[PDB]
Symmetry: D2
Subunit: 391 residues, 4 copies
Amino acid sequence: KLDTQLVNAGRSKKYTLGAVNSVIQRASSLVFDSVEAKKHATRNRANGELFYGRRGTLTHFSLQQAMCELEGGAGCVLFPCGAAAVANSILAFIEQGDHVLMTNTAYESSQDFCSKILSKLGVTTSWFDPLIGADIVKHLQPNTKIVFLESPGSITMEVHDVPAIVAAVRSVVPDAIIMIDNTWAAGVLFKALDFGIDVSIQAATKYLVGHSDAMIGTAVCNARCWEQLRENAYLMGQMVDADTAYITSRGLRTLGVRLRQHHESSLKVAEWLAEHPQVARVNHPALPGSKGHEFWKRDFTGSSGLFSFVLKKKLNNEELANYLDNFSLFSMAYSWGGYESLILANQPEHIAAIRPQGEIDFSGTLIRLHIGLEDVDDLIADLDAGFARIV
Amino acid sequence: KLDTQLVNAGRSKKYTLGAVNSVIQRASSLVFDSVEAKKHATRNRANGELFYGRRGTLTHFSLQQAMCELEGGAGCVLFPCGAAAVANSILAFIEQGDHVLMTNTAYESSQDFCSKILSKLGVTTSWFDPLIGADIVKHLQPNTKIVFLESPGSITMEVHDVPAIVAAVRSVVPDAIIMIDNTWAAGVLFKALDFGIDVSIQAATKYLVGHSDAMIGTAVCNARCWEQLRENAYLMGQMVDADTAYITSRGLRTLGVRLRQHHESSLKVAEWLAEHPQVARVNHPALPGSKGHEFWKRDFTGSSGLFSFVLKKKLNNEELANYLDNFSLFSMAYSWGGYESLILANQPEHIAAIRPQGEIDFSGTLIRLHIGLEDVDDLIADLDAGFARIV
Amino acid sequence: KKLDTQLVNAGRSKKYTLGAVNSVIQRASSLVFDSVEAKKHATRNRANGELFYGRRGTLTHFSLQQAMCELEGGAGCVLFPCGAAAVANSILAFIEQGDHVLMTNTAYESSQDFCSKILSKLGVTTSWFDPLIGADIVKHLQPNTKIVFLESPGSITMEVHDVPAIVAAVRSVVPDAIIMIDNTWAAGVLFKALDFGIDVSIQAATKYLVGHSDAMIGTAVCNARCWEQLRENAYLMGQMVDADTAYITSRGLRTLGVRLRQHHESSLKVAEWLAEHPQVARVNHPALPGSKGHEFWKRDFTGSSGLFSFVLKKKLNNEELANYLDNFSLFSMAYSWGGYESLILANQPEHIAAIRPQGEIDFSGTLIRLHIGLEDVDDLIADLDAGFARIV
Amino acid sequence: KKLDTQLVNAGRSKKYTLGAVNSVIQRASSLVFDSVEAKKHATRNRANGELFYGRRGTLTHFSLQQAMCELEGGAGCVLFPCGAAAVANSILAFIEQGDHVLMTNTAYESSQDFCSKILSKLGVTTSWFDPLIGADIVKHLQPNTKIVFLESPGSITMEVHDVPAIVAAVRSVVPDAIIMIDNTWAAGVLFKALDFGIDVSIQAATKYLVGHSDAMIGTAVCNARCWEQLRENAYLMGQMVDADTAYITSRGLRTLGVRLRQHHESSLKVAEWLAEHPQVARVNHPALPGSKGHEFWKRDFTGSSGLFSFVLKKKLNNEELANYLDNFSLFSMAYSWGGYESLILANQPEHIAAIRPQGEIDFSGTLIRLHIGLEDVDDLIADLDAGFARIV
Ligand SMILES: Cc1ncc(COP(=O)(O)O)c(CN[C@@H](C)P(=O)(O)O)c1O
Ligand SMILES: Cc1ncc(COP(=O)(O)O)c(CN[C@@H](C)P(=O)(O)O)c1O
Ligand SMILES: Cc1ncc(COP(=O)(O)O)c(CN[C@@H](C)P(=O)(O)O)c1O
Ligand SMILES: Cc1ncc(COP(=O)(O)O)c(CN[C@@H](C)P(=O)(O)O)c1O
Ligand SMILES: [Ca+2]
Ligand SMILES: [Ca+2]
Ligand SMILES: [Ca+2]
Ligand SMILES: [Ca+2]
């Protein structure tokens, strides 16, 4: 049962040492009592024995066990933030002459890592429509090494048909590493590894931390891919600090109570918006009619609270300020996943610049909301005062 | 004056806000009061204005200003540890078809990053002897992009002639990026940027933190190289957590009192060892006769406390255990830079495996010591009981 | 304001958050004055949220304090290193040689032991009352009574006071008494103590406000009448909490609503199952009809937390107690409560009798206290059922 | 053992460090018992370094405690949220209605205010003595004296007690008194209080032990005679410090030697320059010949820290005070001390007279207190010289 799992994940006695939570073990240097102990630790340095702080301390091991239990993985590799998890996960499997195939709705810095960093290293990238399903075979090349998914999509929220994509890819390039950015689902609302994906990546910064303070990336790997991701990321010096690891473990405890509120509130806002005279479209995976809703309903076991909607109007600069500057409860900021509700605008032309080898199909201003833990009726009231400012 | 600089570096009122130390600002999301504020922050997102936690908060900005003041740089890029600083600094400047030229005494994982990661990306690496000076021109290729220095060298402690190397490299491949791992000198005992080096990298984990807890890498850049390092590392998601940034700033405060004790103690141990019947050689940059001592004396303004010595004996496994297992005051561990004295052994054949395109010239067991803050006469007593165990 | 929106926003003024969502963490003893004039200004405002000296607080403390005054409707919020320090020092701040303290006999045992072991040797006497005494409290008032100390629900046995009756009765006789409550079970928020004419609402913020069993902190939210005295006398005893703890307590507030609702829903479901169970004598849950003071809870509170107790039909012997407690898979044995993890503790009737001064107990089986956490309620009920099979 | 080696290793047993160099940080209220038997064992040892409940401490606290007993030669180390809480609560733990407390009139002002404002209303009287009274202390002892409270060097004015004389005199008359000292200036280590027959050595660990002006914490290291009473009575008041603060205090110990030596060397160099300066009346530095109790410092201490004061030839008026203090570049205005940053504070003779009960002051110019930090001593002297040019 997810709730019981969340409360206990990673809390082995060897990590908590008489406490409820794991200990916080801050270290670089880790001490070997003897030559024989150093040899034991060296052989087990990637197997949960204390060796050197760059490999982890007890605090890290505890979070790694929790993430493996929650996402059904063989191992969990840690990073200083989600963008570092994305970039280094992809790097760990590529070589000069490879091709990367990425959804055109991937998080922008994931796109930019490929276009700006991988391109100089003899790796080419191309893109696909998130709703392509089994027709992704037209984009597969004999040198396709990575197939990178993000479901729902960044900003626009399109849900992939992961089963269809996975079957297609294994049929043509079975050696491909299939990755997903599974941040929206907090890794627990969509069990990526059970669907044939090799690596489930999170900006743990978001719903796993849950409070908008700490930054951390995770990559949960199947047994086929764990060693290579782990050792190559180690060679790039990737790790997260012990205290952040502790705080992430601690976020897990309330994840189920938080995600149920996020689902209930954001769906009710989405439903209210969908019926509002000033709204063109609502992009929420849980809302019937949204792009790939059917796949959300079949493949996920809940929703989080991030979604977007498109205004009937393309707001001009003065309207955009009147709208966004006068919110009482929604704050303007990047990221999401916390207790506080947030708001961000993107003009159609902003989104057009980040959908390579696609076409946008809306013309009004796109508003993305993260629905936090405030009373939902207060949030709806704030949104409705917003609409009066731009009617 | 270094001491006064250390106490005040980065402590602008905008960062301390009424306290002695900088504030600890934990954040991912950073809030914009208005559209106009978001536009201001966006334009200044790499210029010390609050934008998004991946770019930093006030705590990071404070440490970045301190590191720029201390090392004379245009900018300071932050990483989750030294190995991540090395790997990502080199990555930020390379492209398929480049050559990297690295001292054969570089830190092993720096070697391994090149041999195991860069090699798959169409980048070749070769090596040089640390004492090559101006004859490094024989190793320069028309596609040499990076010249990577580490002075003193890892484990064996050889000091380069940086002036001679730098002049040679600028004369042949002026477009090269010259980097140094300046960890031993804590960035302050050798002012790398004043000698023509482009980027001074530290495992800030070591002497800057000073207490063996926290892990962090720094790269202080000149104005020529700052933008590219900063933006490419950003694309790999490199950052450090706020609290670690705070603790690093805090280590700086005692760095001068610590480094003076480390120098005085370790030189006196080195002198005592050099005269000991059971010692073949002592490798300490401050000790006359050590490899590149003359360059240490001309180019550095002090010593830290890490050095090595070679035993007359190649200890067998039983002797190695009798030696290392029965120390009272020295602990066995990786890393160094803290208050606690540490000891590590390397057999000649271990070092031979990590000196590409060189030759070792010793035959006894090499012992590396980090000399901490304990009474030096107690440490010497512990070393002498050690010698009695293996006579 | 609606609780959940209030919780999210409490304390988060721009002067404390400085561009972030959460307050800054400002760690300091020394706080720097730019000038003689600035120092004079800070000195005047040293108890009024200007930076002065770390013992008085930093911006991190100020934020928590603001949050706590907002949520509990107070003029001020005094901070302490734990619950027990808040209790002991809030009582100390208002007494003097010759005073009498009247305390509920269901008070947390350390609160009792402070009165009987510390206050006694300072010329302050204490006596105790039954938690259901209500209006009849007048019977225990003395000419020198200074403090009337309430705890509702009761420690372990969970009895709810008729607060309206008690407060009216006290004010009718000793209007100038200081009325305090230990309002930890309600998290200060499910029972608005200061709206009921209580002077000081004290919590072990250790519990529900922190919510994760990993920081310790006490709070005392005061009305305007009593704030100064509590604050300044507490300061002379050196009482403060660390900035990092204050930041984590503020943080815990943000999930307090979603957590309390799950604790209510799950704990009531367990309590309802236990009441029907053949091996259970009685269930002590404020929200469960038939428990002591339930109708006062229904009337006076806006919700329940997850802590309650039940009485077994058996008085367990030592071997049965071990076989019961040692073999749980989901409940852990520990003190405290208020966190995400379910906890269990046992007391024998004779242990409880010993901490019920000037009153008698009302049960004879072993008493089991549960903290119902965030685990799936059916897994928890399954673990409790395996427990019962072990002592049939 | 030699101090620097001791400092590095103090508290770092394998049971606390668990493979790291520093102790673990174990954050907890609830501490889990695996069984009834384990709980019974923890309960017996709850004041003896077995995990029991976070109010009693975690492994992090145990480590600090061990370190502090080792460095100060004590049987036990009681922890508090700050210096002022250690003073107030250590005095409280040993008094009862009818007792008398004898305190040096150079005691930290809050220590004085605790006695005169809190203790007075609890039936405890206080009187004061001159710090140089030595053997003549017998003159101020009373049949009901319970505590003799020492502070050496003195707060602000820096007078050093003849501790050997005072202690012998007290023991000759009231052998069962509790003798306490506020040993913060010495960092517990430059004056081994418990070796001189003092019962309790108290510090504001806030200062030199933490060493960076960013955590607050008090300690009281006790002999075997007084440990239990201090510990248990302090516990009934809820006194504890947070685990993270305990970890940072242990951490500060590791650099205490290298820091104190620089504070000694730099502060003595400044003091020697000031004594020769035409605008200075007198220098109050324990290490500087001619200061009050210097010869007791030379005899009894093993070093100096960096805090001292000096008296200007001028009694500065308000405009000269601002022009002096407002325009420093390296010294900052703030309370506290013990950190890496140099600090400056001013007091007028009439402010000091007001906190010197039952004694008189010995100066008439403005009194300037300096904390000499880790900055280059010649830059510091240059900043002080520019200061003098501003009030010529
Ligand atoms: C799906 C997704 N995957 C990765 C990342 C990168 O994580 P880190 O910020 O922790 O490096 C993000 C970041 N997104 C916000 C900044 P926003 O969505 O506001 O741009 C994301 O949304
Ligand atoms: C010169 C030098 N430069 C980089 C690094 C990498 O820093 P991080 O450990 O913080 O990633 C090291 C690490 N060295 C120790 C593990 P050791 O020397 O014990 O192997 C080093 O020595
Ligand atoms: C109502 C109530 N009021 C105060 C305190 C004291 O708070 P601190 O533990 O933060 O000092 C407690 C403590 N209770 C547990 C230890 P337990 O209930 O397990 O004995 C309490 O329950
Ligand atoms: C000797 C001495 N003993 C105790 C304390 C109280 O410690 P805490 O501030 O940690 O509660 C002090 C405090 N002193 C500064 C505030 P200042 O000297 O600047 O007034 C002191 O000096
Ligand atoms: Ca808000
Ligand atoms: Ca040691
Ligand atoms: Ca459990
Ligand atoms: Ca300064």
